[PDB]
Amino acid sequence: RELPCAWKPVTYEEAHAPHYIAHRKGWLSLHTGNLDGEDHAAERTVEDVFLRKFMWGTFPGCLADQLVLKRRGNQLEICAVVLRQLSPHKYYFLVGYSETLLSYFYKCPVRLHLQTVPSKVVYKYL
């Protein structure tokens, strides 16, 4: 263009800035590690990193939004939001596959909670 001539849909998580994390947004992962006195916060962080990368590479172009990783006791719930573009048979295949891999990789009863949506739920435009 020209020098003084210079002088995108976003979901809720994308729209709101980091300084709203406890004001408007929430926390994607929920666990006891960061509480006072509790241990293994770093191990939970590393587990979260691996889960997010694995899920984004195992459901490519399906996840409409970011994961929600809940932990109760030794349970590990992945609440994901996906699109209605892939066939349900492939979704069932991938759910079973991912559940079994993550259970045998983290030695805990992992479980997965797909929620399909017709399309990205755009909050605003930035």
Binding site: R1, L3, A6, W7
Partner: protein
């Protein structure tokens, strides 16, 4: 590769090694900590007496950081190139995010005072080191005539005075800002609107003279080309200054990637003469800091800068000594004096037990990271490297 272990030897001319210690070897160009002339500091403080409170400290810091982190203006072709990719992968917003907003600084009276308080001592130190280069390597040079493009507060004028005042007789100071010209005159007159100038023969002009007939012995441009709004303006200004340069053209910018790129563009422009039949037919070479005229081996991803420590003007916020990091290039008319041009140390020298790290820009146009040790290179060359510092010349031959 100007240091081959066991082959390259110290350059002993004038019987250097025999008659004088290693701490005074001819490539030692380091300057002691710079102190501004008492008249200049007193004038600055007197002019700033009106308002020197906590606001002025913040204003000085903000202006300093803004000038240091300022980028070169974005050429329109660059906007097109980036916009094409952004479209391929809203685009205007992405450009507003990923492009530097370059603005003209209008130096009114308040911003002139702030710029004085923020940059007078730093500019003085940088220009003093640049001038000391010439003085040390050519002690016979006795200039009678100096021009200063973008002479803001007169730092170049004062440094040239401190060095060559017994011969200089005319100081042309070009600056389109009336407030900055007024401030420079007040500084020369002891900070008082009425008085007698400390330096004789200083002429102040608001427009750059453009005529190859009038030619100056030293032409200086310190932290001035970064304020020009486009590459076309920079090119025309550099061409004019080189045309009017008689012996030496000293260009000094901030020691950043932007400053180094600007200076290397100017260096290439001057070296690759395009004028078909100029009034002055003498060619130009790089007197310092480059030992060659080949393209800079650090323009790819790094920069090239030099440091000069100095004592700031006493203020409510200036307590400890500071360091001025600046890029420089000196272009001289004629041809190189001899074929024994020496490597330049372009980074801090690291002294470690029984070895020394020097990063050298060799005459062949390449950088060399040399770890000089006595057993490998020779006792005399090891001691010369041990005593040398950032921005000095290493006397090595063959």
């Amino acid at each position: 590769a100007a240091l081959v272990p066991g082959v390259t030897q110290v350059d002993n001319k004038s019987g250097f090694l025999q008659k004088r210690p290693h701490r005074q070897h001819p490539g030692i160009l380091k300057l002691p900590h710079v102190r501004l002339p008492q008249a200049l500091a007193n004038g600055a403080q007197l002019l700033l007496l009106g308002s020197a409170g906590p606001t002025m400290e913040n204003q000085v810091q903000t202006l300093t950081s803004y000038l240091w982190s300022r980028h070169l203006p974005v050429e329109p072709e660059e906007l097109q190139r980036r916009a094409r990719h952004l479209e391929k992968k809203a685009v205007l917003h992405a450009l507003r995010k990923t492009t530097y907003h370059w603005q003209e600084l209008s130096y009114t009276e308040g911003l002139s005072l702030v710029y004085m308080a923020a940059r007078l001592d730093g500019g003085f130190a940088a220009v003093s080191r640049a001038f000391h280069e010439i003085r040390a390597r050519n002690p016979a040079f006795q200039p009678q005539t100096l021009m200063d493009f973008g002479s803001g507060t007169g730092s170049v004028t004062w440094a040239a005075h401190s060095i060559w005042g017994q011969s200089l007789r005319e100081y042309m100071c070009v600056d389109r800002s009336a407030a900055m010209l007024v401030l420079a005159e007040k500084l020369l007159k002891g900070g008082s609107e009425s008085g007698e100038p400390y330096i004789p023969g200083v002429f102040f002009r608001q427009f750059l003279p453009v005529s190859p007939k009038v030619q100056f012995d030293v032409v200086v441009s310190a932290f001035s080309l970064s304020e020009l709004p486009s590459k076309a303006d920079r090119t025309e200004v550099v061409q004019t200054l080189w045309r009017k340069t008689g012996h030496f053209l000293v260009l000094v910018e901030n020691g950043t990637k932007a400053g180094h790129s600007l200076l290397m563009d100017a260096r290439d422009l001057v070296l690759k003469g395009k004028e078909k039949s100029p009034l002055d037919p003498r060619p130009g070479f790089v007197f310092a800091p480059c030992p060659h005229e080949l393209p800079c081996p650090q323009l790819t991803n790094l920069a090239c800068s030099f440091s000069q420590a100095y004592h700031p003007i006493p203020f409510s916020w200036n307590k400890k000594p500071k360091e001025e990091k600046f890029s420089m290039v000196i272009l001289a008319r004629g041809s190189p004096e001899e074929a024994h041009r020496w490597p330049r140390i372009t980074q801090p020298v690291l002294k470690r037990p029984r070895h020394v790290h020097c990063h050298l820009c060799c005459p062949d146009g390449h950088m060399q990271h040399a770890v000089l040790t006595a057993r490998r290179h020779g006792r005399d060359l090891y001691r010369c490297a041990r005593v040398s510092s950032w921005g000095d010349l290493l006397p090595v031959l063959t």
